[PDB]
Subunit: 201 residues, 2 copies
């Protein structure tokens, strides 16, 4: 019923859609080095206004992140494919200084769509394996987290947004992980509060 509210509340101001978009894009972009503050990003999303000091790459990648988010929500229920992911990537790196993999990725995808039920463990494993394959030059973190959110929303799972911190718990969690051992990432994701339960109002 949550997804229903997300789609229905899309056009109204300060809604579930806009809040989720803001938090997710804020943390996900801040991990990758965006210098947008919460108010600067909110201002950019809402009124298309840029404030504070930023590189051109930061701004363009941010705007692209907004478009990619919208594309991800609009293209829910779609099967994750390589050309799909490349569409998201090229949409993400548009107008920037950028302007063995396929079989392993296909294997990962099949593994994902062979599950009887999807859980935080499955999503986390998909995340680490996707990062391990590393199909793209950059944005594997961003694209990967987008896919992660997509998977969470599609399967009515609790919405956990990877949050930036001062000790870098996310990256360290991915590092401590290894093949066959995804427990640190699962612990990290479980550590995070459910977004559904934060803004239940």
């Amino acid at each position: 019923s949550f997804l229903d509210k997300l789609i229905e509340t899309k056009e109204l101001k300060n809604s579930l859609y806009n809040v989720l978009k803001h938090n997710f894009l804020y943390h996900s972009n801040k991990i990758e080095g965006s210098t947008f503050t919460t108010e600067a990003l909110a201002l950019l999303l809402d009124k298309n206004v840029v404030t504070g000091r930023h590189t051109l790459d930061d701004v363009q990648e941010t705007v692209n992140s907004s478009y990619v988010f919208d594309t991800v929500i609009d293209s829910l229920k779609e099967k994750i494919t390589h050309n799909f992911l490349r569409n998201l990537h090229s949409s993400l790196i548009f107008n920037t200084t950028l302007h063995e993999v396929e079989p392993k990725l296909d294997e990962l995808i099949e593994w994902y769509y062979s599950q009887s039920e999807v859980s935080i463990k499955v999503i986390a494993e998909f995340h680490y394996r996707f990062e391990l394959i590393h199909p793209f030059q950059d944005g594997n973190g961003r694209i990967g987290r987008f896919v992660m959110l997509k998977q969470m929303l599609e399967n009515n799972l609790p919405i956990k947004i990877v949050s930036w911190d001062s000790e870098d718990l996310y990256r360290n969690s991915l590092n401590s992980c290894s093949l066959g051992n995804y427990v640190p990432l699962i612990e990290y994701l479980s550590s995070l509060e459910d977004f559904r339960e934060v803004y239940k109002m």
Copy 2:
């Protein structure tokens, strides 16, 4: 000789080229509503960094103005054509909320002239504004063409300034076909850019 110095310093930073680019783009963009200050514009051109409050369109149009400027200088001494102007336009409005016979007559008229002067530049300017070939960006494209024509014929380089832009628009208003005198008086009122920054090229 000014042109030679302009070309030599094209690749150089904090040079005559960058001074001309900075001033010209500053005034030409500020006329159209850009909120970039001189320090913000200098920072953006030199280090590719955005500061202060701007719309996305302002930023993108500014950067586009930089690229278009570079393209205009690189295609000096080249003849102005419809595909050229359309190229300038598409380069100008890239990634923004948006994205003929009379014109040919004007172009042929320009390239049939024995000599080019401020009178020809002004007449071409007003006629270009009158045709208004593009939906938007006509002022910018037009001023680019003006600068191109000035540079090609070693004419005095006069940059249409935002301080004077009310006088520019009003002089443009007083103009009519066959009468481009107010615009000529206006351009003559403006200081020659060459003679302002003599330290950079002269002696």
